Amino acid sequence: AGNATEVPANSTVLSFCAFAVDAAKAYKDYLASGGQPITNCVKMLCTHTGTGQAITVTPEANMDQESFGGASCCLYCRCHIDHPNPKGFCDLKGKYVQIPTTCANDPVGFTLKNTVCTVCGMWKGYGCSCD
């Protein structure tokens, strides 16, 4: 009974992060010890003529990005663990997330390590027009 959500290539990394005190540090350490990034994310087909903003209602990838389903790029959603936000809610689930094509092999790791500019809506260092 039930419907699978996961593939065996992700069992080890998700188990490790599901038990960690610090899941983000565990994912970073897992990659540094030679582990594979989390796969089975929700990658979208789009026209690559979007705004390029980081977190959006519909896919907004520009020609330098890919669009993904937001929950699928969130380590806390993937491991079914608590989110770090004060109220424990997610800022990616229910949105699409644009990820630079150069980083699209590890969308979960990308969202863990990067920050969205609140003024322009683009990723700091990957599109932000403020600095």
Partner: protein, 286 residues
Amino acid sequence: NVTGLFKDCSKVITGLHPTQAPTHLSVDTKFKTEGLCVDIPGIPKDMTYRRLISMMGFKMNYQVNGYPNMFITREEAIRHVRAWIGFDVEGCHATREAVGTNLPLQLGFSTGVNLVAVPTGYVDTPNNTDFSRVSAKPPPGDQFKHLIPLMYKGLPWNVVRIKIVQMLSDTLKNLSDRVVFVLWAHGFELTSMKYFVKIGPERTCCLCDRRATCFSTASDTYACWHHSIGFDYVYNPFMIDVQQWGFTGNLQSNHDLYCQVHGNAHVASCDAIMTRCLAVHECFVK
């Protein structure tokens, strides 16, 4: 190729919207085309779902620098016999709004302690994962009838995990710097550990040079068995599955080959006492 880890146990016929699905497998078929997914204008997200996610099927076979192995060899376990705590869990089944997973009900230890938990699961919602009470029933059959009264004697998990840490600390503080859980057919015991164990690099206590055996979510601090009062999680425990040592047949038949003083009283603590007893006779007697 799929796994049962994080299986969606809800009875919802359809899959999820692309922005809400944790994975490509869990996106509804209506969005899948040309090897990937598409956003479909006019097809909205679901803003009221509660989907039970199964915690059966963890695989602790990682090799990450600075993080200790949870499962240890028979040789390492023998050196740490003073840290041995038999552990067994009797579960209840998800029912009603979900079906297809086991939830911890009676947690038993070789100290003779049985703790009863409210049936609690990991329920995905549109905003987070809600660790919450879920509908459940004991498995059917006369061998499981003793679990029926336990469905209404459970304590919330925030209370149960404090009691586990206190019991382990009281038992082990003058015996070992660690715990080695002695298991038989470990799958469900490992699923139950998700509710009260955290892992990470080896740490030292917040009040001494001893290794940390406990963690507190109140202060994000680490403690040994001596300084863990009020701590809610077991940190970096070790474990071994005795069934993997070559035994055939059930726990009781193998336990009874060496011992006669532990009659089967059909309770989690009794299985935990028999598992530790069997391991002790196999490693240290004759």
